[PDB]
Amino acid sequence: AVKDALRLVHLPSCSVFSNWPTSGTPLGKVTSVAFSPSGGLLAVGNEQGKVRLWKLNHY
Amino acid sequence: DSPVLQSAYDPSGQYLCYVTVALDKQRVGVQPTQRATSSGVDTVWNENFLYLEDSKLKVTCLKWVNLASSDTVAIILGMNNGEIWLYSVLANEVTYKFTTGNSYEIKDIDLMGNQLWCIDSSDAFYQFDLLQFKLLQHFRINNCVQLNKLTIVPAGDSVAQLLVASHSISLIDIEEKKVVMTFPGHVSPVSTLQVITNEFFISGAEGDRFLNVYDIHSGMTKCVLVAESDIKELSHSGQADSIAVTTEDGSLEIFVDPLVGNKSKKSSKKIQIVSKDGRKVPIYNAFINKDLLNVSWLQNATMPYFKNLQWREIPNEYTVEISLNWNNKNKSADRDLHGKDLASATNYVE
Amino acid sequence: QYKLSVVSGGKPALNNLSSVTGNKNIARLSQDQRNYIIPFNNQIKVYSVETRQCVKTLKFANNSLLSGIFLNESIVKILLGDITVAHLITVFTNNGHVIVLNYKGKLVESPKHFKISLADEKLANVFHSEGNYRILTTFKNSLQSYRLYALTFDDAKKQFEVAHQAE
Amino acid sequence: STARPRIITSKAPLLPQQTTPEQRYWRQYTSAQLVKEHNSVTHISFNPQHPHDFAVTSSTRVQIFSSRTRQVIKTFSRFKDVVYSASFRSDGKLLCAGDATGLVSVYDSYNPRTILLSINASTHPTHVTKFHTQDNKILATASDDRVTRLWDISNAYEPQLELTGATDYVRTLSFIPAAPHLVATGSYDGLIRLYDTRSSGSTPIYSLNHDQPVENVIAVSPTQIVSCGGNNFKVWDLTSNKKLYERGNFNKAVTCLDYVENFDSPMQSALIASSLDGHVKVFDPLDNFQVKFGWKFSGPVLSCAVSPSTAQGNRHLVAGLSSGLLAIRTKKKKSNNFQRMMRGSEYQGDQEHIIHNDKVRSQRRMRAFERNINQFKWSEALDNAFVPGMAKELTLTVLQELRKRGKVRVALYGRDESTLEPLLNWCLKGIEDVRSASIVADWVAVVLELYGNTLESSPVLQELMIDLKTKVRHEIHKSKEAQRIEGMLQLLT
Amino acid sequence: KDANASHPSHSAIQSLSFHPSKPLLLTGGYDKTLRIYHIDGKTNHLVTSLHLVGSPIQTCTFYTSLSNQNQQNIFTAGRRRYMHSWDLSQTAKIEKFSRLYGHESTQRSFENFKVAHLQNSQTNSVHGIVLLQGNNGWINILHSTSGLWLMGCKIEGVITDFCIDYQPISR
Amino acid sequence: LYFPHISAVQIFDFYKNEQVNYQYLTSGVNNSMGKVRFELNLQDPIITDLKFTKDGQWMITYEIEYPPNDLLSSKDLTHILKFWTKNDNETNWNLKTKVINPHGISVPITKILPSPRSVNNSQGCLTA
Amino acid sequence: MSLWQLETNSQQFLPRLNGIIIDCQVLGPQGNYYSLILQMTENNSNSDYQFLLLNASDLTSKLS
Amino acid sequence: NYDTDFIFLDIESTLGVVGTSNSDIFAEQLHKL
RNA sequence: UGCGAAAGCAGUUGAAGACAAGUGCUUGUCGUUCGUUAUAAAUGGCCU
């Protein structure tokens, strides 16, 4: 519905992450989300047709 | 720009080993260059891959072990961890791992039979023996502040002198453990340091369109070969008979008799690949044996494709044309042009 | 000057027994399911399914053995692989000849010919689940009677032995 | 599996006088407007440029009609005596007109107030004033003085060239395309005189004898010239200087003639010819100038014109009558947030590797009778045959299809007099036609063999048979006669 | 690096899916295109594309048979009464699922679907199933390969979403 | 190789030994429905003759349509002649012209002979 | 060819086949293909058999 | 047939005609894999 | 069924055995035989 409306929730604590996403993170109207089976990559599609890729260094 | 981080033909020029990234992990795969085997069995894609289980781990050096020399085909992999992996392509498992005491990444490796020489980022030489699987000796030569490249001169059946390079090039004697000679190198770090023949080794540097041919004994620049664009790979034929250099812009240049105005020579034949629609397909590696030249390019994302051509008969400027998918109407074998089932009978219409 | 030779094929083969229903089709789909084997009255055609074309043809006339056998006898079944023992097929004919042919290649002029021993029995059908083989045969109100034998290959004698099970 | 075949409509063997592709195009000039003018509309011309308004000369005025509006938009009434021409120049900017006094007036088209040039061509009437097609500056005039002066717009005081040699009134002038030097004039002598303006002129290079007073001469092509005079029009070839074709299909004397080519009709080129008998007919130059269509009007036609090839809109056919009537026939020719949310529909995969199309094209909707047959509703399909406003051909097919399917009794079992009369009503009228006579015979035979008892107890069904017996008996007389005329027709041959 | 930087999409990315094993990413949208990218993190070049004329892509997903690993497939669906399957380069082997076997009334669109693994207990065989959303609380379950209608599930009210959970029993 | 099957032509390639087409060349109940019980007594039109011009760009077909039984018109066979055309690249023959009852009513066409190349450059035929 | 769904007694159809169905069988580990034998009873002189292998997914002739 | 040869059809539906090294070892094993 | 043209011209459609039903007798049937050229009807209609 709105831009930058993406949050990552840690489990089993259920506490939303604070450092990311920020005001400067480009997400747009998030319409698709995908986690890689391995390697900890996060792909986020948006209404503009851009698939932006992030890596979780923990994995 | 190129998904293939590193590539290397085998000495015979029939098998190419390339390293690429899958997600965040590097995978090492071997593919067959020839379209068909000697027996005539049609060549097929090899799905097997060696996956590096750690994201940090990376391959810095790739070197083939000559197929004829050893019973088992194997490829030696230098790793940023500070250890060298001996990889057997058939078993698809790392047979043995040579580890240096330190953790610095291996910059370059070279092999002559049982001899195996490597250099770390700390500029410390090491010697290994494949049959013994032992670290023989390690030493540091003064005035070798950086060492990006190592090549062992092919003298007899033993190693008596090593060619090593930085922005400048040097010759070192193993027994004396001291530099024998120095050559004025490039401004940028040296990228290729192959030895064309005796008393003649070529040298090229990153982001440079010039190749310097030096005399090992005398030390004067015999020639300077000039490419249209920057140089990435280099392959020499016979004994200085021909030299093929893969440019950065995706074109392949062939130097015909570069050892015979005289100071600076330009490439004689230029080869390109362009799809039928019009898109240009870059060339990332090549091989040239006697009169046949093998060109390698990437289709899809990382699938390598190969073609064999006889460069002698090719004109000076030659563009290979390849059918790549573009706006293909998709024809299913069980449908005609109009989408009617083939088995179905045509109806009667007045 | 002139000479006469067959060129084209003929009608697809069928299990021409009135009693059998649901077993009329003899054509088989390979284990990898990449090509379909169809016996004709005079040949055996291997069609690649993904491309819808006849990749291979096995003509009885070309072979000496198949020319002698089929040129009356007809194939009663085709079994993928070879029972005696990757692209072998075992053909069972009504009289009892068992012929081991190969597709995807060049036909061998000496196939592993065999002969099941039948006493006034016309082989009607054969089938298997896992290494075990049973053969149904016809013996003689205008109604045909049937017998069910168990078929095994003995390596020592290299022969097919049939043991009576049902009637 | 195969898609179900569509029911094929019955088509009987072709009868004489079928509709031709040429006829179907010319019937589309349907909308007819009849305007009344003060006197005979002597000349009609079309502007060569968009919007292609056409000017009509009548009495002492010239009127320009808007193509789209089909109504007068400009009027040139400065002329004191009768007018005799309104031809535009090739650019369409100027229109010239002749007068009985002999003065030639050049006005700016669409600006009647301004007069650009006034030429006193002769003291006699100036019937023809036509701009040269290739060259814009030179204007041609032919008068009852029998000299066809070639004027120049810049120099209006003396004619550039003064062609002569005509022994009678010259009322026809034509410029040959691709031959700017050549000029063609036809007089009531019956001679068509061709002149070369490059040379000294004043003497025709050669004359073509038409043998009747020539009413209008038109150059259809660079080498072919068609001239209409007397009761026929003849087409001449200049390279051979002989008439290739001649058509005298007209009754009265042909008066006007116009040629249009490279227009969107099935016929590449057309030749319309007025008759003075009320007929204006179309001829095909590609087929030896054979008649392909014709119209009839109240009275004699003096002028005919058709919209130029590049009309760019609704085409027009205009006929001019001596009574003052003008007949015109015309062939007429969400939110941004939502769009950004749904923005992929326009894409056609121009940049993609593989384009895959499986959508089956939409078939036309099937009619009720076809759906019933497809669903094996034999009795209902019969009912749909006899419904109000059902085409006669479409009624024959469902009857033929049911017979072909072998369902004639199957459709007729569960019926009584209430639902049998619609079939008998059609049979009463269908027996007359040759195409449906055979099908009626079969269907009527079955209902009799299947409803004999019901017929006895139903008086309304009986009466349908009495009149039907009368009609079939009448067909017997018609068929018997056709055998007799056939019999005697064999005697002649 | 952005995945779509190499070959941009002309509409919104309606669905994303990583290949279970291979390093591929699949994109889909109302531009009616299925674009596959080789995600490496530095280049992300385009492996291939497939334009489906008049077939908006509301959702797409990879599928790998749990028994026969060699079997790879891509299922895509939109606001249409049919669904597409792409077996896995001269041509593309595309099949269309458009038959519901008597249950067309419950299903007027394939746009919302998911693919799962069903084990046929009485033979111990495993095969894929395609789950669809019906008009009135209806969930229609099809065979992934043959396309047969296997079973249907009904709930009261308007069905909004569903998901699949696996519970192991034994070896 | 063209085989005139009943109411259809089977186009078969003997060099490859595979069928190339099966086309319906007549009207009738041929694939509209599956005949059952008494409908199975119906006889579809029979293609008695099928011939090609010497050029090969025109196909000539002769057909006999059998009326359904137990009607007034149950004994009057209909004889039809048809001329079809196709370009070489195409695979389906397109009917160009249709003659109903050639030679008169209920009179068969026993023989068909396409013309030689000399006359009308092979665009003629005789029916006997 | 009629596929009777025995759970609900429903049925699906594949009509206008080239001939009457002598024989029918499901051919595949997952029923991928259907094998049919067609007769073409129009030709009384000879029995004309045709073997049809259909793709169960969309019921299109995989091999005729 | 418009050539010299003649084709004939049998009732059996048969149309006859009357007319006038380490590398090699590694190559094999890799294909097997 | 034979011949012929499509119209038509000639000529056939028998015997035994078994079974079921009804009451040794009667009828009807035949995934039974020999010989001669030799009404139907289980509510049951075609996808997307």
Residue with tokens 């020399």: B69
Report the C-alpha gap between D127 and D215 in whole angstroms.
12
| DSSP track, chain C | --EEEE-S--PBP----SS--S-----EE-TTSSEEEEEBSSEEEEEETTTTEEEEEEETTTSHHHHHHH----EEEEEES-S----EEEEEESSSEEEEEE-SS---SS---EE---SS-EEEEEEESSS-EEEEEEE-----EEEEEEEEEETTTTEEEEEEEE-
Determine whether the distance from the CB of D202 to the nearest atom of strand I is below 7 Å: no
Strand partners, B32: B15
Crossing angle between the packed helical segments D417-430 and D459-492, to the nearest 10 degrees: 20
Report the C-alpha gap between F45 and F61 in whole angstroms.
12
D72-76 and D94-97 beta bridge pairing: unpaired
D170-175 and D182-187 beta bridge pairing: antiparallel
Answer for the pair D140, D89: CB distance below 8 angstroms, yes or no. Answer: no
CA distance C131 to chain G (A): 19
- Cβ neighbours around G16 below 10 Å, total: 17
Residue with tokens 């060298």: B84
Determine whether the distance from the CB of G12 to the nearest atom of strand I is below 7 Å: yes
Report the C-alpha gap between A23 and A19 in whole angstroms.
10
Quick one: which H or E segment has residue D385? Answer: helix D378-385
Helix (H, G, I), strand (E, B) or coil at B226: strand
Dihedral Cα D383, D386, D390, D393, nearest 10 deg: 100
* CA B350 to chain CA mean position, Å: 67
Q: What is the DSSP letter of D361?
A: P
Nucleic chain I contacts, protein chain D, residues 328-387, CB cut-off 7 A: 374-376, 378
Report the C-alpha gap between C65 and C71 in whole angstroms.
10
Residue with tokens 């030569």: B141
Nucleic chain I contacts, protein chain F, residues 30-49, CB cut-off 7 A: 33-37, 39
Strand partners, E128: E117
* CA B49 to chain CA mean position, Å: 18
Q: Which residue does chain D place closest to B348, by CA atoms?
A: D5
Crossing angle between the packed helical segments D392-404 and D417-430, to the nearest 10 degrees: 110
At CB < 8 Å, which residues of chain B contact C? Answer: 333-334, 342
CA distance D291 to chain F (A): 26
Given an 8 Å threshold on Cβ–Cβ distance, is G50 in contact with C22?
no
Given an 8 Å threshold on Cβ–Cβ distance, is H30 in contact with B67?
no
H, E, C per residue of chain E: CCHHHCCCCCCCEEEEEECCCCCEEEEEECCCEEEEEECCCCCCEEEEEEEECCCCCCEEEEEECCCCCCCEEEEEECCCCCEEEEECCCCCEEEEECCCCCCCCCCCCCCCEEEEEEEECCCCEEEEEEEEECCCCEEEEEECCCCCEEEEEECCCCCCCCCCCCCCCCC
Q: Do chains C and D touch (3 or more CB pairs under 8 A)?
A: no
Report the C-alpha gap between F110 and F103 in whole angstroms.
11
Report the C-alpha gap between B105 and B124 in whole angstroms.
11
Closest partner residue to F32 among D5, D438, D442, by Cβ? D5
At CB < 8 Å, which residues of chain A contact B? Answer: 36, 38-41, 55
Report the C-alpha gap between E149 and G57 in whole angstroms.
11
Report the C-alpha gap between B275 and B326 in whole angstroms.
10
Beta strands in F2-93, from DSSP E residues, in sequence order: 2-5, 8-13, 18-24, 46-52, 58-65, 78-85
Report the C-alpha gap between C82 and C101 in whole angstroms.
9
Helix (H, G, I), strand (E, B) or coil at D490: helix
Q: If you count them, how many residues does chain H have?
A: 33
Given an 8 Å threshold on Cβ–Cβ distance, is E53 in contact with D345?
no
CA of D438 to C1' of I2 (A): 34
Q: Do chains D and H touch (3 or more CB pairs under 8 A)?
A: no
Report the C-alpha gap between G45 and D7 in whole angstroms.
30
Report the C-alpha gap between D444 and D472 in whole angstroms.
11
Report the C-alpha gap between G18 and F22 in whole angstroms.
10
Residues of F in contact with B345 (CB under 8 A): 8, 22-24, 31
- C-alpha distance from residue C163 to each of C126, C151, C152, C153, G38 (Å): 14, 7, 9, 12, 37
Report the C-alpha gap between E65 and G30 in whole angstroms.
12
Which residues lie below 8 Å from residue G47, measured CB to CB, with a gap of 6+? G39
Q: From the DSSP assignment, how many helices (H) and strands (E) are in chain G? A: 0, 6
* CA E13 to chain CA mean position, Å: 15
Strand partners, G42: none
Answer for the pair D147, D164: CB distance below 8 angstroms, yes or no. Answer: yes
Answer for the pair C49, G53: CB distance below 8 angstroms, yes or no. Answer: yes
- What's the start-to-end Cα distance of chain A, in Å? 30
Determine whether the distance from the CB of D33 to the nearest atom of strand I is below 7 Å: no
Answer for the pair B160, B175: CB distance below 8 angstroms, yes or no. Answer: yes
Backbone angles phi, psi at H8, to 5 degrees: -135, 150
Beta strands in D124-249, from DSSP E residues, in sequence order: 128-131, 138-142, 148-152, 161-163, 170-175, 182-187, 191-196, 206-209, 214-218, 224-229, 232-237, 242-247
- Cβ neighbours around D222 below 10 Å, total: 13
Q: What is the DSSP letter of D99?
A: B
- C-alpha distance from residue B281 to each of B129, B321, H7 (Å): 41, 10, 52
Which residues lie below 8 Å from residue B137, measured CB to CB, with a gap of 6+? B126, B127
CA distance E43 to chain G (A): 37
Answer for the pair E24, E66: CB distance below 8 angstroms, yes or no. Answer: no
Mutate to test the interface with C, among G23, G32, G60 (most CBs of C within 10 A): G23
Residues of H in contact with C7 (CB under 8 A): 7, 15-17
Helix (H, G, I), strand (E, B) or coil at D435: helix
Mutate to test the interface with F, among H11, H14, H15, H18 (most CBs of F within 10 A): H15
Residue with tokens 């003849």: D234
Which of B105, B181, B179 has the alpha carbon at shortest distance from B148? B105
Report the C-alpha gap between E140 and G5 in whole angstroms.
15
Given an 8 Å threshold on Cβ–Cβ distance, is G58 in contact with E151?
no
Q: Is C30 on the interface with H (CB under 8 A)?
A: no
Q: Chain B, 172-201: which have a CB under 8 Å from a chain D CB?
A: none
Closest partner residue to C24 among G23, G48, G53, by Cβ? G23
Residue D148: both structure tokens together: 């066809």
Residue F72: both structure tokens together: 């007034």
Report the C-alpha gap between C25 and C43 in whole angstroms.
16
Report the C-alpha gap between D308 and D48 in whole angstroms.
7
Beta strands in D109-168, from DSSP E residues, in sequence order: 111-120, 128-131, 138-142, 148-152, 161-163
Report the C-alpha gap between D389 and D378 in whole angstroms.
21
* CA D439 to chain CA mean position, Å: 38
- Cβ neighbours around D44 below 10 Å, total: 23
Strand partners, B77: B62, B85
- For D315, how many CA atoms within 13 A lie in the half-sphere containing its CB? 18
Residue with tokens 């397109």: F94
Nucleic chain I contacts, protein chain C, residues 88-147, CB cut-off 7 A: 141-143
Which of D128, D288, D289, D277 has the alpha carbon at shortest distance from D217? D128
Residues of E in contact with G57 (CB under 8 A): 85, 95, 97, 145-147
Count of CB contacts below 8 A, B vs H?
37
Report the C-alpha gap between D139 and D150 in whole angstroms.
6
Which residues lie below 8 Å from residue D346, measured CB to CB, with a gap of 6+? none
Quick one: which H or E segment has residue D402? Answer: helix D392-404
D354-356 and D325-331 beta bridge pairing: unpaired
Which of B117, B115, B125, B139 has the alpha carbon at shortest distance from B61? B117
Count of CB contacts below 8 A, B vs G?
16
Report the C-alpha gap between F19 and A20 in whole angstroms.
66
Report the C-alpha gap between D273 and D256 in whole angstroms.
6
Given an 8 Å threshold on Cβ–Cβ distance, is E53 in contact with D356?
yes
B1-24: b or e for each residue (b if 16 or more CB lie within 10 Å)? ebbbbbbbbbebbbbbbbbbbbbb
Strand partners, D120: D103
Method: cryo-EM
Answer for the pair B271, B295: CB distance below 8 angstroms, yes or no. Answer: yes
- C-alpha distance from residue E151 to each of B160, C162, D320, E141 (Å): 78, 46, 80, 5
Given an 8 Å threshold on Cβ–Cβ distance, is G61 in contact with B341?
yes
- C-alpha distance from residue D153 to each of B10, D62, D104, D177, D180 (Å): 90, 21, 11, 21, 17
Which residues lie below 8 Å from residue D33, measured CB to CB, with a gap of 6+? D70, D327, D328, D330
Backbone angles phi, psi at D329, to 5 degrees: -120, 130
Answer for the pair A35, A15: CB distance below 8 angstroms, yes or no. Answer: no
Strand partners, D274: D280
Query: Contact partners of B by the rule of 3+ C-beta pairs under 8 A?
Result: A, C, D, E, F, G, H
F92-115: b or e for each residue (b if 16 or more CB lie within 10 Å)? ebeeeeeeeeeeeeeeebeebebb
Mark the nucleotides of strand I covered by protein, meaning any atom under 7 Å from a CB: 6-7, 31-33, 40, 45-48
DSSP H stretches of helix in D417-458 = 417-430, 434-450, 452-457
- Cβ neighbours around C140 below 10 Å, total: 10
Which residues lie below 8 Å from residue B292, measured CB to CB, with a gap of 6+? B308, B309, B310, B311
Q: Which residue does chain G place closest to F42, by CA atoms?
A: G42
Residue A32: both structure tokens together: 């698709």
Which of B164, B342, B314, B131 has the alpha carbon at shortest distance from F19? B342
Backbone angles phi, psi at D419, to 5 degrees: -100, 0
Nucleotide nearest to F34 (CA to C1'): I46
Q: Would you call F72 exposed, middle or buried from its count of C-beta atoms within 10 A (0-12, 13-18, 19+)?
A: middle
- Cβ neighbours around B252 below 10 Å, total: 29
Closest partner residue to E127 among G12, G30, G57, by Cβ? G30
Answer for the pair E72, E96: CB distance below 8 angstroms, yes or no. Answer: no
- C-alpha distance from residue D193 to each of B236, D138, D163, D167 (Å): 89, 20, 10, 11
Determine whether the distance from the CB of F108 to the nearest atom of strand I is below 7 Å: yes
